[PDB]
Amino acid sequence: KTFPIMLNGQVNGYACVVGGRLMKPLHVEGKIDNEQLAAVKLKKASMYDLEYGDVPQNMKSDTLQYTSDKPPGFYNWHHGAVQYENGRFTVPRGVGGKGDSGRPILDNRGRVVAIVLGGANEGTRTALSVVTWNQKGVTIRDTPEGSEPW
Amino acid sequence: KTFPIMLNGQVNGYACVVGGRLMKPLHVEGKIDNEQLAAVKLKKASMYDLEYGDVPQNMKSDTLQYTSDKPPGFYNWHHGAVQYENGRFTVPRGVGGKGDSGRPILDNRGRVVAIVLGGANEGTRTALSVVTWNQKGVTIRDTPEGSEPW
Amino acid sequence: KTFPIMLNGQVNGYACVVGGRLMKPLHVEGKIDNEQLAAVKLKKASMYDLEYGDVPQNMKSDTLQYTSDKPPGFYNWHHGAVQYENGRFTVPRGVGGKGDSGRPILDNRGRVVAIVLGGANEGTRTALSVVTWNQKGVTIRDTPEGSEPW
Amino acid sequence: KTFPIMLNGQVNGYACVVGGRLMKPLHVEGKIDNEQLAAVKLKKASMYDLEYGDVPQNMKSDTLQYTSDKPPGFYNWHHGAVQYENGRFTVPRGVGGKGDSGRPILDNRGRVVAIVLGGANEGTRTALSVVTWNQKGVTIRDTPEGSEPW
Numbered sequence: 155k156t157f158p159i160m161l162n163g164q165v166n167g168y169a170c171v172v173g174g175r176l177m178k179p180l181h182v183e184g185k186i187d188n189e190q191l192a193a194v195k196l197k198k199a200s201m202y203d204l205e206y207g208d209v210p211q212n213m214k215s216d217t218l219q220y221t222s223d224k225p226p227g228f229y230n231w232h233h234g235a236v237q238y239e240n241g242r243f244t245v246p247r248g249v250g251g252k253g254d255s256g257r258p259i260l261d262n263r264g265r266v267v268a269i270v271l272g273g274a275n276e277g278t279r280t281a282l283s284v285v286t287w288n289q290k291g292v293t294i295r296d297t298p299e300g301s302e303p304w
Numbered sequence: 305k306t307f308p309i310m311l312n313g314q315v316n317g318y319a320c321v322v323g324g325r326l327m328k329p330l331h332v333e334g335k336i337d338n339e340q341l342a343a344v345k346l347k348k349a350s351m352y353d354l355e356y357g358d359v360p361q362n363m364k365s366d367t368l369q370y371t372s373d374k375p376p377g378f379y380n381w382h383h384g385a386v387q388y389e390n391g392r393f394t395v396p397r398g399v400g401g402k403g404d405s406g407r408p409i410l411d412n413r414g415r416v417v418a419i420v421l422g423g424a425n426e427g428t429r430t431a432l433s434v435v436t437w438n439q440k441g442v443t444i445r446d447t448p449e450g451s452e453p454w
Numbered sequence: 455k456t457f458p459i460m461l462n463g464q465v466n467g468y469a470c471v472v473g474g475r476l477m478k479p480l481h482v483e484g485k486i487d488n489e490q491l492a493a494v495k496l497k498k499a500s501m502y503d504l505e506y507g508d509v510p511q512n513m514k515s516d517t518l519q520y521t522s523d524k525p526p527g528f529y530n531w532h533h534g535a536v537q538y539e540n541g542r543f544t545v546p547r548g549v550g551g552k553g554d555s556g557r558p559i560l561d562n563r564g565r566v567v568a569i570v571l572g573g574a575n576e577g578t579r580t581a582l583s584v585v586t587w588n589q590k591g592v593t594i595r596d597t598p599e600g601s602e603p604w
Numbered sequence: 605k606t607f608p609i610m611l612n613g614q615v616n617g618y619a620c621v622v623g624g625r626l627m628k629p630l631h632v633e634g635k636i637d638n639e640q641l642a643a644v645k646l647k648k649a650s651m652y653d654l655e656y657g658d659v660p661q662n663m664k665s666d667t668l669q670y671t672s673d674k675p676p677g678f679y680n681w682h683h684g685a686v687q688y689e690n691g692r693f694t695v696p697r698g699v700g701g702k703g704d705s706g707r708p709i710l711d712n713r714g715r716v717v718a719i720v721l722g723g724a725n726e727g728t729r730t731a732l733s734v735v736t737w738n739q740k741g742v743t744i745r746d747t748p749e750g751s752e753p754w
Binding site: 190210212 | 312313314
Binding site for chain 4: 324361362363364365366369
């Protein structure tokens with residue numbers, strides 16, 4: 155469920171395999187900790203800042219299915235918790251920095267929603283940059299102002 | 305024991321360092337997940353489905369030996385109990401498959417009598433494709449007709 | 455603190471770090487273990503029997519800091535201890551084989567002043583070649599004549 | 605009655621007798637510590653790395669004698685035992701070293717089964733080269749490749 159993207163001994167990003175294949179940020183480069191999914195050739199999409207490429211039948215069921223069901227409430231995160239603020243996901247103060255790219259969130263039912271790019275603070279608690287899907291089934295970015303790539 | 309062969313992550317068969325040097329069946333292909341033994345040219349013998357190679361200077365002692373000793377009785381194997389009656393090898397139904405290409409059967413003493421290739425079933429009990437020594441040092445082939453090797 | 459060398463399914467020599475720098479012996483060949491540690495290049499000085507280089511600055515919390523004295527006493531070591539006589543360093547009978555050239559020695563307070571390269575046996579006690587330091591700070595070899603590198 | 609051979613203060617190998625004939629290696633130079641049989645004329649043979657001798661009518665009774673047949677099993681050695689199967693005399697390393705070329709291996713009955721010459725290292729054991737003779741009685745020498753003799 156987790157596959158890092160590191161380079162020469164420092165953390166740079168963490169990939170995921172969602173619903174049938176994988177994705178990975180584009181400002182994160184170097185070593186990935188497999189040779190199966192490293193052997194594939196990857197198609198890059200510059201507008202959503204995530205590349206996509208298919209994984210073989212060897213990964214037929216170890217993936218994590220996704221949804222768009224986000225009612226207001228608290229969900230779990232890899233280094234803490236989130237807060238649904240009208241489609242603007244957010245991160246507690248100081249938590250999360252360099253080497254936290256592609257980290258997924260997870261709901262109360264075992265469903266993945268959000269992929270991350272960076273973050274920026276406004277007032278009392280830091281907002282973060284989201285890649286998510288809607289009820290119609292098309293993908294969204296919700297990027298804050300001044301959110302540099304982590 | 306034996307050493308496995310890894311095509312694209314998962315199991316294919318087992319390479320037997322047996323009787324003093326290296327043998328691997330020609331039915332399955334792939335490379336070995338052990339680095340000191342695949343650093344040399346390995347010649348082939350495509351007559352009767354086995355490959356012949358060397359071993360380095362540290363596998364003469366622990367390598368299990370062969371003596372073509374045939375009392376007709378119940379031998380043992382990792383997935384059942386193979387035996388030699390009427391000039392045949394047999395296991396009951398619902399056994400083996402792909403990935404089991406080259407696992408040897410042994411005896412009560414703890415040495416090898418035979419190395420399995422595979423086969424199929426035609427009759428009430430499944431026969432097995434095998435490469436087995438005889439009294440005159442002949443590697444005679446016992447395989448029933450209509451059985452593709454595993 | 456001691457990082458080995460990958461040869462063919464065994465170890466040939468070893469390598470350590472000091473003061474923000476790197477060791478290697480000339481007679482020790484082969485690929486080093488760590489991703490950040492191989493990619494830095496070696497400004498080598500082979501006739502002084504050390505291949506130095508600069509280490510990553512993420513390794514600033516692993517190196518050591520020294521002085522250059524050697525008071526009489528006893529020096530512990532991986533294979534027991536090494537004793538201090540004649541202003542020299544000699545290993546007892548039988549102890550010490552091949553491949554340990556590259557690994558350091560220690561004292562009670564735990565600071566390396568000396569690293570091992572060779573060996574020379576006259577009767578019982580064996581005198582091995584040691585790189586140590588001047589109070590001016592220049593490399594020093596106490597090589598016996600008729601020595602032998604491990 | 606194993607006899608010592610020493611050159612000018614050092615120990616290089618030991619001397620043996622069987623059947624009334626003094627066989628010693630031509631591996632290392634070395635002189636005899638006795639006045640009796642130091643003048644026995646010999647005929648230098650370099651086929652087997654061994655060379656015979658002669659016993660007068662003073663030591664004609666106390667000569668340990670030989671055997672031509674051998675059963676598979678364990679034996680009596682100066683530092684342990686040895687097993688014999690697959691045409692092999694091998695012992696693990698640690699026991700036995702330099703100065704052992706010319707120490708007799710013998711059966712528990714008390715007959716000289718063979719006389720060693722040296723051998724090689726192999727993993728956890730040592731393939732030990734030897735000279736012996738089968739049921740034909742022709743003197744056989746065993747040459748493991750990769751062996752520097754003792």
